[PDB]
């Protein structure tokens, strides 16, 4: 029923500074089972690396070396939080949090998991505007005709981190619908990428919303990208 | 010690096409580990699909069906009804069933195996084609098409940049297309297609 929620797509620091990966559960209870952290490094399996139980201890996978992660987990806020210090190029992975989730009853649990955040060491600071810089693309009239849909386009472009996420909604309704997506293109040290979506006949009226998620995005939020309906 | 190795790293199937992902262990017995599948898919990441004896994810039990094949500690998924959103990776992932201390409830992965959609052998078609703009940017839209290799083509005089196009599967298992580019005459611009030995253009629908 619940589910965990990992906001920083990707979380970009230069050597030797520290950083500080979230999660927050929602619909799960937290005080009860441990949250878990795993790390899977370029080329890596997915692998144990952290987890902090309710009591508060807080175990680390084998090999790990010291003074090098921290976990925690305030309950009231319902997050947890992986610190990495002194962070470094061999750092350079997705983290991907994870809890078991109790179903019914004893012997029936699952094992639920974040989307993870990957993260990016560079190294010097960037100084310049990394946003992605969208662009609306409205149907062609003539497909209006074709199987009377019509399909919408947003362009993002000269983002950084090229770590991105894009889906649609109906503005009002907002649940995620069915679109499709090219890959994620370089161009010259920043790239960009674009999804479309064909709404059918009846749709045509509604207003949608292109919603882009980037580490770099204006404020830190989400980007809302509004489709006019026609 | 204990590892998880997947049979192929890539494992392509056709839309509709039963196909089964293997996994097999090489450290212990499949019998005292509880096996996990997962996959991550564009869009959703990580999803949780089987885990040890009928438990399915919400909406996984459907499509798919997971088992085990402790002859030779093998895991397995099949997948029954492929479609595009069944284009990605899946891991296999496994872990210890109660031990006698104080044990962990970590699992253990393997590396994933990618699987990638293509629509099934079918009879070819003439696509549609069509152009949206926006200043100088001219988008070229192919529509229903089959086979899949197609050139795309935006009838420009003065073209500032041209980006790599998209083949992606259709709602009605075929092809669609898009391909963008930066244009000073864009509103001029039309799009020309050459796909199945014929010539199709923006212009042909107006």
């Known amino acids: 029923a619940g589910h965990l929620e990992q906001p920083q797509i990707s979380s970009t620091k230069t050597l030797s500074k520290t950083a500080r990966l979230e999660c927050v559960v929602s619909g799960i209870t937290i005080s009860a089972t441990s949250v878990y952290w795993y790390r899977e490094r370029p080329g890596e399996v997915i692998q144990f690396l952290v987890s902090?139980?309710?009591?508060?201890?807080?175990?680390?996978?084998s090999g790990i070396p010291s003074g090098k992660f921290e976990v925690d987990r305030i309950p009231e806020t319902s997050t947890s939080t992986l610190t990495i210090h002194n962070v470094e190029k061999q750092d350079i992975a997705t983290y991907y949090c994870?809890?078991?989730?109790?179903?019914?009853?004893?012997?029936?649990?699952?094992?639920?998991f974040g989307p993870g955040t990957k993260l990016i060491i560079t190294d010097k600071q960037l100084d310049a505007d990394v946003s992605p810089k969208p662009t609306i693309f409205l149907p062609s009239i003539a497909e209006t005709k074709l199987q009377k849909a019509g399909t919408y386009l947003c362009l993002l472009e000269k983002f950084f981190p090229d770590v991105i996420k894009i889906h649609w909604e109906e503005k009002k309704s907002n649940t995620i619908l069915g679109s499709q997506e090219g890959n994620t293109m370089k161009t010259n040290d920043t790239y960009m990428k674009f999804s479309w979506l064909t709404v059918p006949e009846k749709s045509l009226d509604k207003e949608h919303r292109c919603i882009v998620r980037h580490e770099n995005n204006k404020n830190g939020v989400d980007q809302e990208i509004i489709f006019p309906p026609i | 010690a204990i590892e998880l190795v997947p049979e192929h790293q890539t494992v392509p199937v056709s839309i509709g096409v039963p196909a089964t992902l293997r996994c097999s262990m090489k450290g212990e017995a499949i019998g005292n580990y509880y096996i996990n599948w997962y996959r991550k898919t564009q869009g959703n990441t990580m999803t949780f699909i089987y885990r040890?004896?009928?438990?399915?994810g919400p909406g996984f039990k459907d499509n798919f069906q997971g088992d085990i094949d402790i002859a030779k500690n093998l895991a397995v998924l099949k997948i029954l009804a492929p479609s595009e959103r069944d284009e990605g990776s899946y891991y296999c992932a496994c872990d210890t069933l109660g031990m006698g201390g104080e044990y962990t409830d970590k699992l253990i992965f393997g590396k994933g195996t990618r699987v990638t959609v293509e629509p099934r052998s079918q009879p070819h078609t003439k696509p549609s084609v069509f152009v949206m703009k926006n200043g100088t940017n001219v988008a070229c839209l192919v529509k229903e098409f089959y086979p899949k290799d197609i050139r795309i083509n935006l009838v420009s005089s003065k073209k500032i940049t041209e980006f790599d196009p998209a083949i992606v599967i259709s709602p009605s298992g075929k092809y669609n297309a898009v391909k963008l580019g930066k244009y000073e005459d864009s509103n001029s611009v039309t799009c020309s297609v050459q796909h199945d030995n014929k010539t199709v253009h923006s212009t042909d629908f107006e």
């Open positions: 994870a809890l078991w989730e109790a179903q019914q009853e004893l012997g029936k649990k699952i094992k639920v």
């Open positions: 902090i139980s309710y009591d508060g201890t807080v175990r680390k996978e």
């Open positions: 040890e004896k009928d438990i399915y």
